[PDB]
Design a protein around this ligand. Structure first.
Ligand SMILES: *[C@@H]1OC[C@@H](O)[C@H](O)[C@H]1O
Length: 33
């Protein structure tokens, strides 16, 4: 499902986003790569 290095992440207010654990990058939209 999810591409390499990405993992799902979430704010203290309950808002979900995406985080790259290899690069420390982050984004709201679901990652294609
Ligand atoms: C929840 O935390 C992330 C921020 O971007 C949103 O505006 C807030 O509601």
């Amino acid at each position: 499902k999810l591409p390499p290095g990405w993992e799902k992440r979430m704010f203290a207010n309950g808002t979900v986003y995406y985080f790259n654990h290899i690069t420390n990058a982050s984004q709201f939209e679901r990652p294609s790569g």
